[PDB]
Structure 1
Amino acid sequence: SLFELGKMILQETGKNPAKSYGAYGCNCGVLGRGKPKDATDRCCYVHKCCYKKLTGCDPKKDRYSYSWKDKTIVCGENNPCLKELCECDKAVAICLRENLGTYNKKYRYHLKPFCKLADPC
């Protein structure tokens, strides 16, 4: 769910998830997908494509178990769909941290991002 996701993003990036990634570029946010503006934006693109492969479980609503041992995300969930979901969320959190170096505030928006079409997932 959004609780686990936001938590991972905070844990990995050290950033307020909503403020930094709730409306960034074409893919970070709640306005579907678009052609990635940069590395950070591409993380969010991969994340949303990752959601699309899931079988029946709800990425926004369904909770799942994970651990934070040795400052590392560990998906302990036994439920197969929830496990894949957790790995989806873990992967974007790591990807976003990995790309803080090129993070640019100019890609933030308030209404809608100017985007080209995204390649199909």
Structure 2
Amino acid sequence: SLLEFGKMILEETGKLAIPSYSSYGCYCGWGGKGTPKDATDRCCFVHDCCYGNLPDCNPKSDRYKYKRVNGAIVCEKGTSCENRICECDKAAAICFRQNLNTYSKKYMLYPDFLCKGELKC
């Protein structure tokens, strides 16, 4: 659920998911269209696509449990939806950390009309 992904973001990047990642580029937070504008925006694209492969699960509200062995994210057993929602979120957070160095403030509150084109998952 969003409660875990956000805590996971915060743990990983240091930044609060809202506002840092709730309205970035074209795909972080409202994804529907356009070309992702950068690494961080591509993470959100792959993340939206990850949720997309689970049409019968509920990413935002279904809670899963995870632990850290040292720095590592390890998804605990749950229902199959929960394990797979957890895997998509783990990916996004790693992806966010690996591209912190290019995170740009100019892509915060990015306007919608500047997001043009379908890109396929």
Runs of 4+ in 1 over 3 A off after TM superposition: 110-113
Matched to 2:87, the amino acid is E
Counting strand residues as a fraction of each chain, which structure ranks higher?
1
What RMSD in Å do the two structures reach over aligned CA positions? 1.6
Q: Which blocks of at least 5 consecutive residues in structure 1 are unaligned?
A: none
**Distance of 2:31 and 2:47 partners within structure 1:** 14
**Distance of 1:12 and 1:93 partners within structure 2:** 6
* Normalised TM-score (structure 1): 0.91
Number of residues paired by the alignment? 121
Residue 63 (1) aligns with residue 63 (2): yes
Indicate how the Cα distance of structure 1 residues 42 and 96 shifts in structure 2: closer, same or farther if over 3 A, else same.
Answer: same
3-state secondary structure, aligned to 2:112: coil
**1:31: how far off?**
4.5
3-state secondary structure, aligned to 1:5: helix
CA contact 2:24–2:109 (8 Å) conserved in 1: yes
CA contact 1:55–1:81 (8 Å) conserved in 2: no
3-state secondary structure, aligned to 1:49: helix
Q: What is aligned with 2:26? A: 26
* Normalised TM-score (structure 2): 0.91
Identity among equivalent positions (%) equals 55
